[PDB]
């Protein structure tokens, strides 16, 4: 019958052996297993979306974009596990390489080198550039979205809050509200963005580098707000022009109701910290987003000159511009959505 992990069920059938129990989640589940036909250790998230329209899109997307994408430094699909049938699926099984660890585990125990953290900024920025030309935001940058295998290979997974990028729409109230990771958050998500620019992406790795000189993060703001109150603190009032940007009032008039606060120098926040890694950090984390570096020319920054090869960093053939409006769209035509784009994978293609 269909083998057990921890309880559930988890028939990957006659290709996956030897199940090993690694993490859960919301829907997920990850196992360790034995790949038959290519005799490598893998790893399989189960995802089990169905009962929420909210988990389809997550899965949707994901699986749309992972599939189209091949880059290095991001995650692939190996295979796909589904019933033959849309009325008997009420799983997907996703077969991805698998990876040892993440940023996440990492920074919680081990101090980077210079060296290390050079190169798994280069990594990033590297698969976000193949990203960001297709024209897709991840939008969920975080340590713990970032795996590493045994050698210090870097790669990007979960897509799930990704959109294909909208800068002409990215304008909002003040205060509304937003679903990726709070500690990541660039400012602008709280006074006017919706988080539809590229630029978004660039603030959240400036978080992650700032993470890695520290092993801390740098603005764990406790609620909403706190996470813009953090960020100030340490950038510093906004000067006019930075101001002179934000036209809602709402957000212009609750920073002109705070009190000067004065730039923290990044040399004092990271003082063993190499001169050149600060500087990059310095144009990753600016608080006015039209100021913020592009990803290509972080990657010609400095710092990463030692790994700097527009060659070697390849962009994506096939750019989106299929925002797909999976959100106006009832629970079946994304289960039937999910059911096709995994087609690919079934036996007997």
């Not at 100021?291 to 790994?307: S, T």
Request: hydrophobic share 35%; charged share 25%; aromatic share 10%.
């Amino acid at each position: 019958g269909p083998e057990m992990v921890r309880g559930q069920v988890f028939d990957v059938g006659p290709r996956y052996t030897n199940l090993s129990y690694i993490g859960e989640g919301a829907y997920c589940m990850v196992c360790s297993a034995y790949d038959n036909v290519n005799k490598v250790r893998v790893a399989i998230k189960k995802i089990s979306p169905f009962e929420h329209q909210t988990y389809c899109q997550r899965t949707l997307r994901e699986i749309k974009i992972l599939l189209r994408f091949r880059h290095e430094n991001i995650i692939g699909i190996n295979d796909i596990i589904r019933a033959p049938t849309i009325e008997q699926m009420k799983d997907v099984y996703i077969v991805q390489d698998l990876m040892e660890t993440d940023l996440y585990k990492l920074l919680k125990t081990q101090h980077l080198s210079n060296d290390h953290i050079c190169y798994f900024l280069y990594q990033i920025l590297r698969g976000l550039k193949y990203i960001h030309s297709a024209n897709v935001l991840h939008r969920d940058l975080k340590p713990s979205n970032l795996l590493l295998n045994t050698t210090c290979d870097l790669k990007i997974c979960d897509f799930g809050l990704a959109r294909v990028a909208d800068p002409d729409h990215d304008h909002t109230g003040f205060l509304t509200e937003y679903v990726a990771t709070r500690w990541y958050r660039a400012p602008e998500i709280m006074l006017n963005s919706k988080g539809y620019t590229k630029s978004i992406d660039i603030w959240s790795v400036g978080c992650i580098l700032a993470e890695m000189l520290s092993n801390r993060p740098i603005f764990p703001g406790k609620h909403y707000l706190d996470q813009l109150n953090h960020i100030l603190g340490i950038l510093g009032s906004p000067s006019q022009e930075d101001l002179n940007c934000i036209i809602n009032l709402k957000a212009r008039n609750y920073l002109l109701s705070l009190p000067h606060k004065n730039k923290v120098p990044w040399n004092r926040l990271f003082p063993n910290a190499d001169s050149k890694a600060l500087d990059l950090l310095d144009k990753m984390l600016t608080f006015n987003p039209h100021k913020r570096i592009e990803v290509e020319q972080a990657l010609a920054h400095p710092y990463l000159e030692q790994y700097y090869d527009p060659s070697d960093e390849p962009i994506a053939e096939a750019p989106f511009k299929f925002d797909m409006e999976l959100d106006d769209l009832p629970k079946e035509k994304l289960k039937e959505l999910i059911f096709e784009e995994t087609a690919r994978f079934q036996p007997g293609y």
